[PDB]
Amino acid sequence: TTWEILAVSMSDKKGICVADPFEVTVMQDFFIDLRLPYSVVRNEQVEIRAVLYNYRQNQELKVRVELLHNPAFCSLATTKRRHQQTVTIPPKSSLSVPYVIVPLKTGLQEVEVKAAVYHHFISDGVRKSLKVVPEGIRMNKTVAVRTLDPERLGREGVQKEDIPPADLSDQVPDTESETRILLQGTPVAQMTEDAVDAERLKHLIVTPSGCGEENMIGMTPTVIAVHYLDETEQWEKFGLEKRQGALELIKKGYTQQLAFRQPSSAFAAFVKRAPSTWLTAYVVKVFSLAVNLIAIDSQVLCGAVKWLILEKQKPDGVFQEDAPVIHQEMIGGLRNNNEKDMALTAFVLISLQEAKDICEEQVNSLPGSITKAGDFLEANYMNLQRSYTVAIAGYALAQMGRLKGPLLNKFLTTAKDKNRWEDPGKQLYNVEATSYALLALLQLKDFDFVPPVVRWLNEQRYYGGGYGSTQATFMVFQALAQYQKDAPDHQELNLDVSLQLPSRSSKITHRIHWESASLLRSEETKEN
C-alpha cells in the first residue's frame, strides 16, 4: 500500500510544528491479496477469495497457488494432501482463487496461502488471522441495579447487598461469559441561597465624620459593605475600581476614631466625657473585622480589650455601662432596659472573642475573662424572656460550644415559625436579633434550620442605612456574608464500596469521592 509518514517537531526555542505528510508506496510485480472477513461463525461453511495480481507489463505468469493445512479448519487440504491449483495470469491483470473452509474451533485462527511461478525466481505468501465467533447471538442480561447509600438504606453505617447469579440457562454450549460489575458515584450538589445584589448597596459608602460616636455611625455602613462585597464577590456589578475610594474612607475614619481614644485605651463621645463601656467594646467589634481591609494597630485594638477586662468587669463576668452614649439609637436592641446584664455582657463578650485571635499574645487575661462572662450567661439563659436577648446571648455561647442541652432547646424554640427572632415593636430590633441567631446557627453548623432563617432576611429586603440602623446594618450583612462561606455546594461524597466474590480470596475495595464521582469503575468476572 502507501504508508503516510507524519512528523511533529518540538523545539524549546522555535516551538511546535507538524510537517506535511510524506507518502511511501510499496508495490511488487507479483503478489497475493488474501482478503478475509472480520469474523466468521464456527461450523458454518464459508468461502475466502485469494486474488493473485500480476502487474508485469508484458508477460503472462504460470503460477501455482496452494492453501496450507490447518487443524482448526476443514478444507480439501489434508496433512498428506496438498490442495493446490495451477493457473495462468495474463499480463497487467489479476485472478481470483476460491477457497472453501469450515472453522472447526473458535478463537483467532491462522490462514496462509502460498504461490510460486514456473520458470522464474518469483513467489509470494500471505499469512493473516481471522476471528471465529461461536454460533449464536450476543446477549446481555441485566442481573440487578442496586442503589448505594448507607444511612438511608443502611444500618450502623454499613449496607449489605446480595446479587443473585445470572440466568444463562439458554446459553450456547461450550462458550465463555463475563459478568461486568460496575460502580459510579452520583452527585448530588444542592442548596445555597442568593446573596443581596451589590447594586442595592450604593448608599452604604458613607464618609465617616463627627464626634467619637458620630464617626463610628458613619464608618459602619462602609466597613460592613466592603466586607460583604469581598465575600460574595459582586464588585463587578457594583462598579469595581470604586473599592479604592471605599478603602480610603475606612482608613480616614480609622484615624479620626483614634483622636477620640483616651489614654486609658478606651473611647467616648469626647476626650472630656467619661469612658463608655459599650462604645469601646463596639470599636473592638468593627476594628477586628477591618483587620483584613486596612492596617489596625494592635496597641489600640488590644488596648480597648484590656480596658474592658481589667477595669470594667466584675468577678461575675458582668459588664456594666457607666457613661451611656448620647446616641441611644446606635446601640440597637440594647436601648430597652429589660435584661441589661445579659445583653451587655454578651455584646461585649462577642467583641472580645472576635478579637481573640489578635489579642491572644498581648492580653493574658483574655481566656480567663472569656470564661468568666460565659459562666454568667449560661446561668441566666433559661430565664430570658425577650427573643432579642436570647439571640445575642446564644451567639455568645455558641462561639464557645457551650450552647447545649436545655439552653440549645430554648434558643431554637424562641424563633416564631422557625424563621425569625422577633419582638413586639420596631424593625431594628427584629432584624438585628435574627442576624445574631443566624451567626449562632452557622456556628453550631446546623444547616437544617438555617435555610428558613436566611430566606426570611432575604424576603424582607433590608438594605441597611438610615437613622439608628447602625446595629441592624453591621449585623445583617455580617450574618449573610458569613452564610456565603459556610454554604456547601453538595453533600458528603465518600463511598467505601467493597465487593467480595466467592471465587476470589481478597475483597475488591473502591472509594468514590465528590471529584472522582461519575466514574465508570468496572470489575469483570469470567465466572458466574
Binding site: G157, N494, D496, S498, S506, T509, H510, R511, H513
Partner: protein, 274 residues
C-alpha cells in the same frame, strides 16, 4: 508473620514511641530510623519478637550515614525522611522457631532461589522482577486491636507514580515546598490512594514495618514504612473518611544496599556484588 518485630522506646514523661521492624538475621532487626534519636540510649529501647512477653536487650542501633531529618530546616522543611532506615543488633542470638523467622532481602543468593532465578542473576535483574515498571501488588502488617493483620496495597511504580508523589504537598509542613521532588527522593516507594484501588493506610504504630511482596509462596521485603501524608490512625479507630491524597511513602531497599550489604556482611545472607 514470624519476621514481625515490635519496637518500643521509653522517654522521660515525653511518652513512648511505638514502631515496628523485621527480623532480617539472627542478630539484626531492620526498622525505620526516625523511631530513635541520638539521645535515646540502649537501655531505653526494648525490642520484642515472636510475640514473646519479654523484651530483648539491644547492643547498638545502626543509623544510615545519610540520615539527617533536620537537613532541610533552612529550605523550610521540618521533616526529611530521606534514607530513613536503621538496624538493631541484638545482644543475644535468636533461635528461629515457629514464631520467629527471618524475611528475605533484595540482592541476596537466598532471595534468588525464592524467585527461582538462575544463580547467575545480577542485582539489577532482581529489581526488574520485584519492582517492575507498573502497579506492583504488595502488602504490610498492621496492628489491629492487639492482633496482627495483613493489609494489601499497590506500589505505584508505573505511570501513577507521578500522581502519587506530588500528593506529598498535602502533608503537614510540606504545604509550602517549592519543588515537591525535593522532599521525595528516589529512595522512596509510593503506595496508598484510590487508583487502581482503595489501599489501606499505614498507621503510626506500623511505622518502620516491612513493605512485603508475596510471590510464589515467599515473602520478600522491598521497603520500610517511613511516613504517610494523612494520619488516619488515631488510637480509637481508622478515620473512616480518608482523603484521595492520603498516600504512604517507604524506603526502597534497592537504594540502601551498600549500607545493608556492609553491615550484614557476617550474616551469611550472601549479598550479590553487582
Amino acid at each position: 508473620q514470624p519476621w514481625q518485630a515490635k519496637i518500643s522506646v521509653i522517654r522521660p514523661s515525653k511518652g513512648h514511641e511505638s514502631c515496628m521492624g523485621a527480623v532480617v538475621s539472627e542478630y539484626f532487626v531492620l526498622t525505620a530510623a526516625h523511631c530513635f534519636t541520638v539521645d535515646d540510649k540502649e537501655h531505653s529501647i526494648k525490642v520484642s519478637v515472636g510475640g514473646e512477653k519479654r523484651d530483648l536487650e539491644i547492643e547498638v542501633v545502626l543509623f544510615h550515614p545519610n540520615y539527617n531529618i533536620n537537613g532541610k530546616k533552612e529550605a523550610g522543611i521540618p521533616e526529611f525522611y530521606d534514607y530513613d532506615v536503621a538496624l538493631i543488633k541484638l545482644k543475644n542470638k535468636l533461635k528461629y522457631g515457629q514464631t520467629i523467622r527471618p524475611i528475605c532481602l533484595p540482592c541476596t543468593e537466598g532471595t534468588t532461589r525464592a524467585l527461582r532465578l538462575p544463580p547467575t542473576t545480577t542485582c539489577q535483574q532482581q529489581k526488574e522482577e520485584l519492582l517492575p515498571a507498573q502497579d506492583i501488588k504488595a502488602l504490610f502488617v498492621s496492628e489491629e486491636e492487639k492482633k496482627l493483620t495483613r493489609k494489601e496495597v499497590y506500589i505505584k511504580n508505573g505511570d501513577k507514580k507521578g500522581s502519587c508523589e506530588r500528593d506529598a504537598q498535602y502533608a503537614p509542613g510540606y504545604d509550602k515546598v517549592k519543588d515537591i521532588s525535593e522532599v521525595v527522593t528516589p529512595r522512596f516507594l509510593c503506595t496508598g490512594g484510590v487508583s487502581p484501588y482503595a489501599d489501606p493506610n499505614t498507621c503510626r504504630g506500623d511505622s518502620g514495618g516491612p513493605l512485603i511482596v508475596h510471590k510464589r509462596s515467599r515473602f520478600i521485603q522491598v521497603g520500610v514504612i517511613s511516613w504517610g501524608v494523612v494520619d488516619v490512625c488515631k488510637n480509637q479507630k481508622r478515620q473512616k473518611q480518608v482523603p484521595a491524597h492520603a498516600r504512604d511513602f517507604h524506603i526502597n531497599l534497592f537504594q540502601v544496599l551498600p549500607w545493608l550489604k556492609e553491615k550484614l556482611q557476617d550474616e551469611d545472607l550472601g549479598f550479590l556484588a553487582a
